[PDB]
Amino acid sequence: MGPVWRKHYITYRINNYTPDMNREDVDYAIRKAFQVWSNVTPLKFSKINTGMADILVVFARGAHGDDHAFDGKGGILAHAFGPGSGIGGDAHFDEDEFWTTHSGGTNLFLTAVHEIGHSLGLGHSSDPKAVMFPTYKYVDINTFRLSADDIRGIQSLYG
Numbered sequence: 164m165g166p167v168w169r170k171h172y173i174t175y176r177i178n179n180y181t182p183d184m185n186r187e188d189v190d191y192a193i194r195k196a197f198q199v200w201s202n203v204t205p206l207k208f209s210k211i212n213t214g215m216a217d218i219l220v221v222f223a224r225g226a227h228g229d230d231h232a233f234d235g236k237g238g239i240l241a242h243a244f245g246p247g248s249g250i251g252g253d254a255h256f257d258e259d260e261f262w263t264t265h266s267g268g269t270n271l272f273l274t275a276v277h278e279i280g281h282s283l284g285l286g287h288s289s290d291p292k293a294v295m296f297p298t299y300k301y302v303d304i305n306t307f308r309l310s311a312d313d314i315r316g317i318q319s320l321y322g
């Protein structure tokens with residue numbers, strides 16, 4: 164078992180907003196992505212605008228201040244740090260992607276589900292059905308379900 168948050172109340176903050184989407188659509192996608200994980204664990208997530216936010220959500224491009232530089236449009240879509248203080252837990256999204264509420268460009272919701280999985284301590288899954296599989300693929304939000312493997316993984320960390 165890798166690092167996990169040692170509390171069940173976890174805050175997040177949206178540092179900045181991609182211009183690709185309306186602001187309310189970014190809020191909604193991120194909120195719904197957290198809800199995917201709280202639906203199957205004892206964890207609760209609250210959005211705050213300053214202060215001690217555990218998970219900082221950031222949109223940035225190329226070299227952006229950590230050791231995980233982005234690569235322009237395509238390739239790496241986002242990355243996130245596992246539980247820990249400071250940069251720990253933070254989720255970074257490559258602004259060179261075109262973020263969407265839908266199937267065009269890169270769907271922010273699904274990518275956020277994957278990245279939050281990392282922010283909570285999950286590694287990649289070798290199961291192609293799992294949201295933690297390494298490669299992105301689109302599916303409608305209304306049809307999306309965590310896989311049994313994703314649920315096994317997150318419940319092994321938090322119950």
Ligand SMILES: NC(=O)[C@H](CCC(=O)O)NC(=O)[C@H](CCC(=O)O)NC(=O)CCc1cc(-c2ccc(-c3cccc(Cl)c3)cc2)no1
Nearest residue numbers: 237238239240241273274277292293294298299300301302
């Ligand atoms: N196919 C690709 O490789 C794409 C885009 C290609 C491009 O335009 O160059 N890039 C990415 O995928 C990069 C790859 C980084 C690397 O090269 O290793 N991945 C990263 O950046 C990881 C981020 C990521 C992965 C996912 C994901 C979404 C849905 C499912 C899902 C599971 C089951 C059923 C269904 Cl329908 C969907 C699984 C994973 N969201 O954000």
Ligand SMILES: [Ca+2]
Nearest residue numbers: 217249250251
């Ligand atoms: Ca943090």
Ligand SMILES: [Ca+2]
Nearest residue numbers: 235237239257
């Ligand atoms: Ca990229």
Ligand SMILES: [Ca+2]
Nearest residue numbers: 183258260261
């Ligand atoms: Ca963009």
Ligand SMILES: [Zn+2]
Nearest residue numbers: 227229231255
């Ligand atoms: Zn980063």
Ligand SMILES: [Zn+2]
Nearest residue numbers: 277281287297
């Ligand atoms: Zn990943």
